[PDB]
């Protein structure tokens, strides 16, 4: 009789951007009061609906996607903005109806040396369309002669590691985005 | 050896402020966190919140929000805890437990500070 | 807040047998459920972590299995000197929550 905003906000392992974990929250009382009224976040930016008046609208299907991106790529998670995270990772559709909640978390996700587990796709031969998780790791060929199976000259493995340190600037730190797409 | 010595069997009046020690050695102290669990005699372990061993931020568990604080004096390989304003319902052991940032499974090793109170 | 109930409370066993102790999480802990043991007057010890994989350096008489909200480790060869207050743990949602414990006893 209350929607799971505990299984998706207070969690231990926010996924990596390439495999953004999406949960279907449905048939329950959602209280978007706790979320907006918490100052832990740092980019509530709600495109479509209005952050303030949000507890009343009966959203038909709430799909909380959740990932970890660079500390400066919070922009690429905004309807329209395009680049590495948008085109070759997670794309917020041109007409996104919902909010892009996000904390720049260092303590939890940054290791002195590098938590190399939060990953990100770079070289990708397909700008991902709205809400797509290209979990594949195909050795990307770019120059000419197909490598196929081997990494080397003019052949780069896509999924590159972020590697986050507790020293890195507030734009290179790990950022945990939880875009709350509504109907 | 990778073992976490702990402070001796404490005992204090209901209202003192005391500080158990978890001095580490053997691993890179910075690498993992420093969870702190407690266990009342007739009950079970309860996590109480860690401290990022490069900053010292005490992100306590949602229950032990108040009088407990974790004081990290790094470069000495120490991760002290400091219960404050002790009550008569805290007559429990308080363990150290190296549980990292990416793992969060403890290997709960703390010899156990027998914090009796009366 | 994850209400982790492990059952049965106190289940006796006899030497050399095979005993199963189960653990049920109120919400989903999907595959983060570690397993500890604690002989009295001791700091517990990890036994199974992520509910399937085994810790290196454990006497591998027991290993665990499960997923979702149903988890267990079954002692494939018990020996008397255990009587260990076994503990669940999850690692999915803060706060990490343990289980009260399935104390073992010989007849
Ligand atoms: C995730 O956990 C958060 C963070 O703890 C929960 O939000 C609320 O957080 C505050 C502390 O940050 C806690 O409030 C408590 O309220 C009770 C009742 O007034 C009070 O006795 C305590 O001293 C404390 O102030 C509490 O952990 C929690 N609120 C609750 C449940 O009472 C949040 O519920 C969780 N999920 C979300 C939406 O992120």
Residue numbers in the entry:
A (entry chain R): 334 to 516
B (entry chain H): 1 to 118
C (entry chain L): 1 to 107
Show the paper's wording:
Omicron (B.1.1.529), the fifth novel SARS-CoV-2 variant of concern (VOC), harbors 15 mutations in the receptor-binding domain (RBD) of the spike (S) protein. Among these mAbs, R33 exhibited ultra-potent neutralizing activity and targeted epitopes that located between P2B-2F6 (Class II)5 and S309 (Class III) epitope, but do not overlap with the hACE2-binding region. To reduce the risk of a human-anti-mouse-antibody (HAMA) response in clinical trials, R33 was humanized through complementarity determining region (CDR) grafting onto human acceptor germline frameworks and named hu33.6 In comparison with the affinity constant (KD) values of ACE2/SARS-CoV-2 RBDs, the Surface Plasmon Resonance (SPR) results demonstrated that Beta and Delta variants partially affected the affinities of NAbs to RBD proteins. In the meantime, hu33 was a mutation-resistant and broadly neutralizing activity against Omicron-included SARS-CoV-2 variants.
To reveal the binding epitope of hu33, we investigated the complex formed by the fragment antigen-binding (Fab) regions of hu33 and a prefusion-stabilized Beta S trimer using single-particle cryo-electron microscopy (cryo-EM), and reconstructed a cryo-EM density map for the one RBD open state at an overall resolution of 3.1 Å. The binding site of hu33 on Beta RBD is reminiscent of S309. However, when compared to S309, hu33 moves up towards the RBD neck region that engages ACE2. RBD residues including Leu441, Val445, Tyr451, and Pro499 form hydrophobic and van der Waals interactions with hu33, whereas Asn343, Ala344, Thr345, Arg346, Asn440, Ser443, and Lys444 are targeted via polar interactions. None of the three mutated sites in the Beta RBD (K417N/E484K/N501Y) are involved in interacting with hu33. Among the 15 residues that are mutated in the Omicron RBD, only Gly339 and Asn440 are located in the peripheral areas of the binding epitope. There is plenty of space between the light chain of hu33 and Gly339 to accommodate an Asp side chain found in Omicron RBD. Moreover, Asn440 forms a hydrogen bond with a negatively charged Glu57 in the heavy chain of hu33, and its mutation to a positively charged Lys may even slightly weaken the binding interaction. The comparisons of binding and neutralizing abilities to the wild-type and Omicron variant reflect that hu33, a Class III NAb, is less sensitive to changes at Asn440 than S309.
